[PDB]
Amino acid sequence: AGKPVLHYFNARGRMECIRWLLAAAGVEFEEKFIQSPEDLEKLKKDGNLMFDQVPMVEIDGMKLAQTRAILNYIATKYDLYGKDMKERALIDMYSEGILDLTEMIGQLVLCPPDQREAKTALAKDRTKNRYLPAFEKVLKSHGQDYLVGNRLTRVDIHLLEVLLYVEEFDASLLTPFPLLKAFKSRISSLPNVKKFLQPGSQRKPPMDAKQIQEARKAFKIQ
Amino acid sequence: AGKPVLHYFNARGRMECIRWLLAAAGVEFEEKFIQSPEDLEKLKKDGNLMFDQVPMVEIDGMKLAQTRAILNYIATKYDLYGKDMKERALIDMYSEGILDLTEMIGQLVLCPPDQREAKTALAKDRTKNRYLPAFEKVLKSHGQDYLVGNRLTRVDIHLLEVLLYVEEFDASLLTPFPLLKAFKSRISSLPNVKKFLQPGSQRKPPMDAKQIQEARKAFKIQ
Numbered sequence: 001a002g003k004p005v006l007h008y009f010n011a012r013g014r015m016e017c018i019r020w021l022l023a024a025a026g027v028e029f030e031e032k033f034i035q036s037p038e039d040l041e042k043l044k045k046d047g048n049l050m051f052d053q054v055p056m057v058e059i060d061g062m063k064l065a066q067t068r069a070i071l072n073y074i075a076t077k078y079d080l081y082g083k084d085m086k087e088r089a090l091i092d093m094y095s096e097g098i099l100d101l102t103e104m105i106g107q108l109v110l111c112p113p114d115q116r117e118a119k120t121a122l123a124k125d126r127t128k129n130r131y132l133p134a135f136e137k138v139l140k141s142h143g144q145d146y147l148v149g150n151r152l153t154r155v156d157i158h159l160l161e162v163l164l165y166v167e168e169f170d171a172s173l174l175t176p177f178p179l180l181k182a183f184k185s186r187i188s189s190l191p192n193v194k195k196f197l198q199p200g201s202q203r204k205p206p207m208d209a210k211q212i213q214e215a216r217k218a219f220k221i222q
Numbered sequence: 223a224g225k226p227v228l229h230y231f232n233a234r235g236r237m238e239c240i241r242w243l244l245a246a247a248g249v250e251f252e253e254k255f256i257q258s259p260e261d262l263e264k265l266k267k268d269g270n271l272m273f274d275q276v277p278m279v280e281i282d283g284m285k286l287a288q289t290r291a292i293l294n295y296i297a298t299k300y301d302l303y304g305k306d307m308k309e310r311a312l313i314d315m316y317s318e319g320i321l322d323l324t325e326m327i328g329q330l331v332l333c334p335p336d337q338r339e340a341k342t343a344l345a346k347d348r349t350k351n352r353y354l355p356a357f358e359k360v361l362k363s364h365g366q367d368y369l370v371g372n373r374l375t376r377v378d379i380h381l382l383e384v385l386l387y388v389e390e391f392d393a394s395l396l397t398p399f400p401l402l403k404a405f406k407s408r409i410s411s412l413p414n415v416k417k418f419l420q421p422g423s424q425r426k427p428p429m430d431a432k433q434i435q436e437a438r439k440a441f442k443i444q
């Protein structure tokens with residue numbers, strides 16, 4: 001049970017939020033990449049994936065599948081899940097909004113070409129008029145350095161991570177939000193985070209059109 | 223307040239799992255139905271919704287949004303979340319597969335006719351070959367009456383609810399699973415569950431495509 005083992009393709013996808021959480025907690029981990037459909041098949045057939053899906057993480061003797069379940073477990077284990085019921089409620093509400101924002105932006109690459117522009121316009125609108133203002137408001141409401149409980153929790157990490165993708169999506173979206181900029185800088189300066197951001201870490205890059213098309217093809221899954 | 227207040231459309235949607243969890247816990251609740259676009263606009267403008275979305279539940283001084291955030295809080299508050307992080311890891315993984323199954327079947331009524339048939343076949347294949355076998359397997363792995371910790375938890379309620387939707391979708395899907403059939407009757411027999419299953423409770427009915435198109439027309443939500 002030394003280092004947790006992360007089962008996923010060699011890409012961000014749904015496993016990146018988990019890599020971010022482990023890195024932030026300073027927890028060393030290994031990765032076993034699914035490079036071929038045959039790799040994915042073996043995992044399923046061997047009974048390692050409860051729903052024949054990844055993310056799957058081997059940790060503390062479990063074969064834990066489902067992103068949210070992996071995150072909640074890691075967050076609790078390393079005291080990054082607040083101190084009680086009420087703090088976890090704020091943490092979960094904020095985190096679900098961030099996961100929604102992450103999916104809205106990330107799914108654009110899979111949109112049918114004829115729907116892509118409209119979907120992209122809607123995503124930019126939601127990002128700048130619904131999500132960014134919501135988080136800027138949280139920070140303003142209490143003036144604290146962290147989102148919840150005046151101390152670092154998993155959602156501070158989730159927010160930094162999604163702001164990076166917002167910056168990749170459209171850098172002008174962040175301009176109107178001073179507190180979030182300040183927050184991004186603060187979280188980025190934490191030792192474990194800075195280290196994960198530097199070149200050479202297990203942090204993953206975005207995938208380009210050709211890659212996406214090629215990878216999604218060889219595996220074929222509806 | 224005293225009784226939690228559930229803000230949602232008069233329909234199942236994302237709020238139904240919450241009505242179920244509360245009903246099961248024997249906690250009485252009230253509902254404030256969103257019956258028109260104006261109702262929804264009012265809720266937003268008055269500062270009720272963190273991300274201008276429902277579900278939103280008023281409980282213990284919070285105006286809590288995000289389905290999962292609401293479910294996690296209620297489950298913890300009423301001792302339906304197991305006893306430790308390891309039981310919660312199983313409860314969470316199970317719950318997420320159930321939510322995935324619910325969405326997969328629920329989405330069908332929004333598939334354009336030239337896509338619905340194939341999407342329906344996929345949903346049935348996934349239900350009987352991926353999802354149901356997974357839960358039948360958990361029940362067989364310990365031979366106990368409940369999914370986790372040999373005690374009623376939130377996931378036994380989530381599993382009963384989704385079994386109802388699978389039964390509405392295609393009853394013959396359940397026949398090959400004797401343990402799931404026995405589990406269904408057992409959970410259905412619990413006092414609070416029996417109360418919620420009987421006529422006149424706050425449980426909600428399904429909505430055909432016709433009903434969907436109609437309602438989802440008046441609001442013109444993107």
Ligand SMILES: N[C@@H](CCC(=O)N[C@@H](CS[C@H]1c2c(cc3ccc4cccc5ccc2c3c45)C(=O)C(=O)[C@@H]1O)C(=O)NCC(=O)O)C(=O)O
Binds near residue numbers: 066
């Ligand atoms: N609610 C669950 C969801 C789990 C889930 O969907 N997992 C996917 C991989 S992630 C994602 C996904 C799928 C297919 C592929 C196929 C090739 C591929 C190559 C390189 C990187 C990724 C990254 C993500 C991904 C996929 C790839 C597509 O399944 C979907 O589009 C998923 O959204 C999977 O294992 N698919 C195998 C299969 O169903 O039999 C959770 O949160 O954990």
Ligand SMILES: N[C@@H](CCC(=O)N[C@@H](CS[C@H]1c2c(cc3ccc4cccc5ccc2c3c45)C(=O)C(=O)[C@@H]1O)C(=O)NCC(=O)O)C(=O)O
Binds near residue numbers: 231235236288438443
């Ligand atoms: N991750 C979050 C998701 C929250 C969420 O998506 N909420 C939706 C309602 S649920 C669902 C939804 C939408 C629109 C409508 C519009 C009319 C409508 C009438 C009667 C019943 C439902 C049931 C669901 C529903 C909708 C209706 C469509 O938004 C989507 O399709 C949603 O998936 C909403 O409030 N939309 C208002 C808006 O964005 O401004 C969570 O789990 O809590």
